[PDB]
Amino acid sequence: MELITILEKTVSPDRLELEAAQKFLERAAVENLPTFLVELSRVLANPGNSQVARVAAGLQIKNSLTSKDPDIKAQYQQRWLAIDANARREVKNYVLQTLGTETYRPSSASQCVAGIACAEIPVNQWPELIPQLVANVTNPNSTEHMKESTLEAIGYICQDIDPEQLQDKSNEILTAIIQGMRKEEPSNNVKLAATNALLNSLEFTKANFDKESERHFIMQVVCEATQCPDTRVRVAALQNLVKIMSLYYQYMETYMGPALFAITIEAMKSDIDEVALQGIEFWSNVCDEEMDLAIEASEAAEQGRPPEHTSKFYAKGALQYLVPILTQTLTKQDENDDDDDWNPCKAAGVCLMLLATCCEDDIVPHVLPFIKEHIKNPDWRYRDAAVMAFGCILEGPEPSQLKPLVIQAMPTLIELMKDPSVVVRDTAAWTVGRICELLPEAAINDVYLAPLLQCLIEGLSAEPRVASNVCWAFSSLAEAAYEAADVADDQEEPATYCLSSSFELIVQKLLETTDRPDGHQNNLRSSAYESLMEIVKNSAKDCYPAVQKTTLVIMERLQQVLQMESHIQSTSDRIQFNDLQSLLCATLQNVLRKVQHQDALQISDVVMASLLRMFQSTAGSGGVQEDALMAVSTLVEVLGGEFLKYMEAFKPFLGIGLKNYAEYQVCLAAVGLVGDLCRALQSNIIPFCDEVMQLLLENLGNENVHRSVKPQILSVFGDIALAIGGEFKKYLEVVLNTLQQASQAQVDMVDYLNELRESCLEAYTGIVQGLKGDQENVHPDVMLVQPRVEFILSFIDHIAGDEDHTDGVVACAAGLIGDLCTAFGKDVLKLVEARPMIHELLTEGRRSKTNKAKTLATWATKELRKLKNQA
Template sequence: MATEGLINILERTVTGSQADLEHARRFLATATEQNLSELLKHLSDILITATNNPTARAQAALQLKNALYSREEAVKQVYQDRWLSIQENIRDHIKTNCFNALGTETTKPSQAAQCVGYIACAELPRAQWQDLIKRLVDNVTTVGRTDNVREASLEALGYICQDIDSNVLEPQSNLILTALIYGMRKEETNDNVRLAAITALLNSLEFTKNNFQNDSERHYIMQVVCEATQSANLKIQVAALQNLVKILTLYYDYMEYYMGPALFAITMDAMKSPHDEIALQGIEFWSNVCDEEYELQLLQQEAQEQNRQPERTSRYYARGALPYLVPVLLQRLTMQEETDDDDDWNPCKSAGVCLMLLANCAENAIIQYVFPFVSANIKNSDWRNREAAVMAFGSMLEGPDVASIKPIAEQAIPFLLELLRDSNVAVRDTTAWTIGRIFEFVSQAVMTDELLRAIGSTLVNGLDDVPRVATNICWSFSSLARAAYDHAESSADDDTPNTYLLSPFFDDIVKKLIETTDRPDGSQSNLRNAAYEALMEMIRHSPKDCYLTVQKTTVTVLDRLNRVISVESHASNPNDRVQLSDLQSLLCATLQSVLRKMQPNDAPLISDPIMHALLQMLKTRTGTASAVQEDALVAIGTLVEVLGINFMKYMEHVLPFIYEALNNHSEYQICAAAVGVIADLSRSLLDKLTPYCDLIMTHLLTCLSDDKLHRSVKPQILSTFGDIALAIGGNFKKYLEHVLNTLNQACRAQVANNDYDMIDYLNELREGCLSAYTGIIQGLRNPTTTNTAALAELQLVTAQLPFIVQFLETIARDPNKSDSIVGAAIGLIGDLVTSYGQAMLQFVEREPFEKLLAEGKRSKVMKTKTLANWAIKEIRKLKNN
């Protein structure tokens, strides 16, 4: 591999023709496969040689970086392991070249800094390249180093801080912070160095906890960051404000000392800035204050309910700042432009979100600051003020209590209906959104025949408006359907009301929504999806006297689905196929809504054509079939629920597709959908599932044994074991040994305390295990068997009891357990007590169990509370006996 030839190849990746580019890519891919270490060595040699063409140097660094880093965590791990398998002397050569290249490049940002950063991310966690951080810090703080070297070294520190586990860097946090603060000082004359330091600080804030706990260190950090917000350089100002936003979120409890003297004034000035980038950070700061304080209010309420002191308390900065914040936010709302794009994030949109968060935080107190603005501007001749008034009103609806906001909403309705016909599209758009918010948060204000008739007819007409307005009107119908349904009266033994306020014009709304799904401009502003979503909500929340419309909608949806399937088989254009697949997904989801509203006698009458359509979808073998197969399987699951035992006649037709989906481990969503269908079949067919279980269990156990299958499917499979065991009772014995061994392994899983994604996954995995154990024990204790037979069956699990109890204790002691885990664990405790009687007494009197049951009794989730009371009662019975 001649260096000159490689330089030529690298240059052609930028300046050559398409053919040159393809040739270069193939060459580099082959070189990577055949001798990666040699390729990386040559690339680092090209990077370090200052006389080489800047393009070749930049591309050499880029190729080197791409061999070390991927945004996909699994791929990145593979790349890091591959790097570490390279001989140490070659790695040292590459590292030396990359480090020495810092500050020698003519392009910015430094590519060498990225290479150093990503090598460090592979090596530092494994205690290698241990002198790197000190050398980078020395580059920044040693007098005489060039500005370019200092800037590139700070960038390298930033890349390391951004991508590495914060625990790895904590021991060196003081050293890193020294360099960053040194580079950030107002005395620093080079803006590029200062900006690189501030950007790196933003990435390092998570592991500077110890520094923030120290008063003098914290004061100095805050002083330097606050001074940077006053820089004349716009980029430095923005980066410094970004630091303040993040510091507020991470270290809220330490901010009282700085809020009055510095942070309030800095962020208020930022919110008023003519520069959008600065204004956005100022607004974001106060949005984060609101987020934090709302969370603290909830924790405080929870503590009060439990008669204890909260661990942390709110400083109520947002409430205190209301008189100053609200006018600035309202002023920002009036600064929109006709040309504003829906997808562009700007201070006007940010101000609306901040106002919503502020309303949540300040509750009734917000009204006195917002309502005068709404009254003064809702009829203003300037559309900007009208739209701002409507946005302000819609934004404040969620926080105040209903009694306080209802009279204002009642006054506003006539104005809003008039504004739905406004000449300006932005005003109509925001008005449609605000009406939806009224339905969502203060529906009591509109729940009269007369008002709903006026609103309903205006909204139906509004569905002919431009897509962005019609989309929000669809969303309003979704909110209205839920509100009307909740408002209706239903009997204690039947959740579905006989009628509700929308019944007189329910059919008209549904017809218009179906018409809207067919609009030729339906792909704009997500209109078609919104119309189908509204249609689903209308059907889901329909009373008995609208059932005829539900029946007609079922036929319409099925007819459309068949037409789309037919058209797709002849479509050759890839874009057309994608659109048709999306449409099939929407129709499948809508079909599920109508099926769930089907009366038991009607479902079998239409199930044959529905099943035929869904099986046709599963037969599709195109590149876009994945999502369609998943949706078809989910729809089949719904049909199983609706038909119950009547689904038996389709089993032979459906199972081959389910097995095929279970084997599709690369597209795990399809596999997960198939697992869901098996759970539905278990719950509906009960012991009639037994003849099919051998093959089903074989496929499920194969899924669990494949390490490449996405982890999210595995908890679902464990839970499904419980469903199958519950369905087939004693017939589950033949699978018991395999399943118990599998559960044994799953229960032992552990994750790092600071990896929140993995903590969530561990909770899901444990909940799957709990569901499996519960299903097995309840299934073996099947009420159809005699007590003696049931006891004999249960003996099969007796040897596992100490392990199951130990697992439950682990859950009880885990501070990160979810609410649903608490309920599932308590349910299993109750089942163990009722199944094993006195044998369980030695276990349930332990402290972890008592604490878990007490936690369940305090739960806000009614099901968990009920389970806790039942389990405690069963334990008490045992003790009394």
Template sequence: MNSASLVHVLERTISSDKNERQTAQQYLEQGMHSNTPEFIKALSDVLANSGNSAVVRMAAGLQIKNALISKDQIVKEQLQQRWLAFTEDTRQYIKGNVLKSLGTETRMPSSAAQCVAFIAVIELPLGRWPDLINILCSNIINDASSDNLQQASLEALGYICQDVDFNCILVHSNNILTAIVHGMRKGSSNHYVGFAATTALFNSLEFTKANFEKEMERNYLMEVVCEATQFKDPQIRVVALQCLVKIMSLYYEYMDTYMAQALFPITMEAIKSNIDEIALQGIEFWSNVCDEEISLAMEDNEEDFGQPSSSMSRSYAKGALQYLVSILMQKLTQQEEFDDEDEWNPSKAASVCLLLLVSCCGKDILTYVLPFVKDNIKHPDWRYRDAALLAFGSVLRGIEEEVLKSVIENAMPTIIELMYDSSVAVRDTAAWTIGQICENAAESATNPVFLKSLLEAMVHGLKAEPRVAANVCWAFVELAKGSYDDASVHDSTNEPTTYCLSQYFDFLVEKLLETTARPDGAQAKLRLASYEALMEMIKNSPRDCYPTVQKTTLIILERLNHILAVGDVQQRYDRAEMINLQGLLCATLQSVLGKVKSEDAPKISDQIMTALLQMFISNSEQAGNVHEEAMRAVTALIEVLGEKFIKYMDSFKPFLLSGLKNHSEHQVCLASVGVVADLCRELKVGIMPYCDEVMTLLWQNLTDSAVHRSIKPQILSLLGDIALAIGPAYEKYLDVVFTILVQASQIQVDRDDYDMVDYLNDLRESILSAYSGIIQGMTTEKTVSPMEAHIPYILEFIKTVAIDNDINDDVTCACVALIGDLCTVFRSQIVPKFDMNVINNILHQARRSSITKTKNYGRWVTRELRKLTRPSW
């Protein structure tokens, strides 16, 4: 394809004619596949030719970018390897063209800047293109450079700072900062250059640590950023404020010098701004301050820290409280009645900041919030009533109930009254505030003085607009939990006989069932919220509400059968709604089965299992949520039926095995693993006829790299559950299982990645549990012998775990339990094989644990070891 043809095709990529666009895209894909290096060279020629139209040059840049980068990590690596396979001459030619294009485009942002950055992402980590940063910096600080060249070079530098590992460009950090500051200084006269420079600074702040540690350099940088917050151009001001927000997170410990004189007045003024984007950044700054100070407070209270924290809280939030709260209250009054739920605005940001201030400053905030609430909760303007409610609800979280009790009792009649307000926004916030009261001060919510009128208002709210009704449903969730937790328990069942909602329970469940069937249930996620409320009401019900539980079980089962009888629906929307409804019904079925008495379960189990099997049959594997919830419903049925579930095993087995194979929907696979674990616990040796097929699938999952990593720890733990269930019959699996466990115990992870350290702990806990299950399950005189060969591996793993400083309490508990199992089975013959320094150390940790279970295991194993090591007389 010659240059003229390529230009013609690129022009067609933005044609209004769909067929022309598709044809052009096909030509471009053909050209890219037929000779990629030459085609990208040709594209770079089009980009570099200033005689081409802005549209064509932008389209050429987009094609080059797409040839270098992808959101998919695997494709991205393939594209990078393809680029590196080009000849040196080809790569230099393309790089020369994209650099030459900088500053010659008339449309911004610069396509050439993006191309430069994406090539840099590939080459800089490999030590290639060593002069790039110097070229860009020179373009920026050179007074002879055009504004366009400075802007495009700053954009490229910003992209590079954002996307390249900062260690690759750390050596250039001073030059980069010099160039960026030069651009920011120019921002007062050229806002395009200033915006590009300030954005570049925002992207480079992570690797300026060395500069922030030096007072002179830090002062200069802070001066430049603070100046930029005062520029006339709103875009620059927004990004400069974003820089301050980020600086507060990264360099909190250095901010004392600047807080009173600069940061406080700048951010307060920003919050007052009528430009939403500026106000949002001012609020975000103080939300970030709260986040930092909450984290520092948690560190200070953590007993396990062996040394003092590297940073201490300066209590900026508490110092700003009286000024900040007043401004935030005003922002709360700037909402609109029908604000887009997903649109972030200063009013919503102020509400979040208020919640963080409560967590950070505690009851001190009440001094500044309650007068506003008192003055405005009956204000003629709905915005002020709504703001007062929102402020009141926000301060309930994190403050002791005793402090709030009298305040809530005084406010409750008014809050109930506002559930009938003429404004939908006020009713919505009133419902949310009631939920906050139920969650954080349940005793006040269930006060007999208010309970009847409160419930009447909530039931009235269930008929209101979906957004209001959804918040009422959440309030019912919290009310159910609080009422159940506060109920008196008089026997060993830990289940109360009655509670404050008992006399209303049947009526409330009926109204929630009506809400789940509302035709507008898809709005504001009302159907989901109402089913969740129904589930929590059932789950948190006392014994005198059991007749309603029985009735609800039959209603849910009837609904499930009805939805299955409807069959396939042609419209995709209806089909999706049906799948969601099936999932919700299954989840609700789990809740009601959890309350059904074991003697009543067999009366309805045939109907339930028939419905669940029909769900497995009628839904494809793509309906992952339905399969997952159906599996969990099976789990609930297993738990209530116990060994009587065996009658369903043959009909259920195909779907269980299918679930274990379902790697594409890993939550389904996880739920299926959980079902097998429950079957082992309830059926015991009854699971044996199904073990060969199950074990085969478990091994396949463990050895398949495509299987989601979250599944593997659960499978490893399940290997022990199966051993506990079938006992000596497990011997035929023993060698393979131990090989798998040894391999799993050798896995290493990046210790700087906290997620991977957590995963390693999960893996180790599961391995330890598996060893315990196998040892307990196979404890007979006949089967002790085959296990002895594996003892050295178990002891080595215990040692590896015990000396690791990154293990959590769950791993400690599992490790100590395994030591106890070894002592119980192998008695005195195991003791000489222990490394007693290691064993004593982890037992000491267990005994000092704040978790009762771990502490008890530590004490038990310590006593057992003393018995085994005590001299016999």
């Protein structure tokens, strides 16, 4: 029928009827998209159409130009740009004129205007957009909707467009935003839209802020909006101050004292939770930023050079005034507790905890009073806060100032574990655990240990919000006791730690608490096993016989339930069985890594035997086909080479996992196993490489899917390489294909860009080190990659450019530089010195963030040295 009738039906509840329209419009966009969008835009522009139709039409245009999937989003944009320059010209003039003619609140034009902009802006294909949008907001005769919707467009633009290509007009974008935000603006709806619009645009106003005149004008309009009689705006503007402080910290000194200080604390001191939440954040962010600077200042000094950015210690100054606002807000506990609800009460504890790490000592004399004053308050709210606050400040004052107070705090803490209110007891175990975690010497004491250990054992039977916390308190205690025993006993494991006489009592309680039916509440099950692993790992050698017994119990459970899973009744049953499986599978990874190696083999020969029996019955599909390949992976560790025996019977299941590409998740964990199979059987995985490498190349040969995967199959190609040596020749061919194309990859798919670049790098190393030698005869397969050295260095050269550099990538790229020199032998020097950016990437690596990013980077220049004295 008529596009108008088909649209009013896309929103028809009748399932069959809805599909009809969704397939009519669907196919209409296949046959002739240009015509479609012109007619759909006309329908949106005509005010005379029904609200439903109009909105249905704009949602259609929106989903022809954008999506959540970046690869798909980047595809709808290319399809749009390839259309007739005039068809697009009509679509734009309807979509753009629609602004202001919509009585419905959320405009559809905006998200279209937005959708089209992200595609046309980069290429200067829509020169109407900015001056027409700015014109609609600054014209004095513009209606409420007109200003509102237009700012709603700019709000989406900055948020959806490539962060880079917009700085040119940052001048225009900003003049329209701050105009909407002006106190004299009659509508609060407009103000909020604009204030929210500025929030997503500050990311490129760097050129504007570098100018006193404007920066100052922006700051005023922002602070003035923190006084608006519409909470929605108040917060939005307060959100800006938070952002403005994280991007333009270098500036804030001028405004801080005379304005920001008054505004920030008034919100914290508010009665409105929304506003309160934003003011507390403001300061914990300052605390985070002035910390990230103390690191810069500490590293630059270790080089003597001036730190590019300087701290102005604002927290240190605000400390006096913040503490009482925080400690008092701790008092607003949420009786009806929810470990999923974020509120000022919880927010206030984090800020105190952060204020303690940032300023250190100074904090102590400001919190102690409240503590000793409320520690025994008849009303728990002030009693809990007196204990919460105590904990938050345990990190980041001198260990030689808290120990005496802590010791002098133990007995009262011990008692608080017998408190009438759940909340007080919940926070008490956390404090005890933090005391055990940061200042062990007070827990592992010949005075309070016995009564403390007794406190925690009973605590395991308390309520889930207490029981869950006690476990961490135990594990933190056990790690310490172990460390306090193996300071230096000449051997690897200690003789006996002061939990040796109670170990057997300790372990069985955690074995019970694991099955407490109310285990889902407050993450008890998970925490309970997590504690058992940590307490078994950290244990005295004379507790072994007790660890054996515990290990026999965990195996027994991965049976009671691992034949459960070959008899599933429901998807609820399906789900919990796997949740138990996983918890036993992970508690398995540490008991094996603990018992005698001789013993750890017989346990593994049993579990793998059972996993082999479970795989055959559920090869088709599988609830039991994800966390099981993860259980297999560790059984493939506590046998190493010995796993060869299993390989043939397990091979096809490595594969059905590999073939299952629709559930990329299984597949991901499957592809990882292959790597582990490669390192356990160096040179016995040869009779399996070839199916696997096949099942893997097919996985990449066609698109679709989804694309976390690609980077891990690539990385594994390297593992295979190393393991099968001159058998890689067969595939090296197509391998450098995917590699070649995947390096040229371009785009928070960042973070994914880095992850993919690291995979390629890791693969290149695997192939090179794989086809070169140890005790060889001569060498020379590697040189089959010789023609790529150029690209490899040139792909690494481009990595040196991107201001991203995840220190993991610098490592694998640095390490690869080393490999090429060791293979490729002084022709590489001329190619590396041709790219100055490579020298800079190695120097950046020689500075340690993460460790042995330095070691791989210190070793690549090392190899690139004594080339210089050879020929």
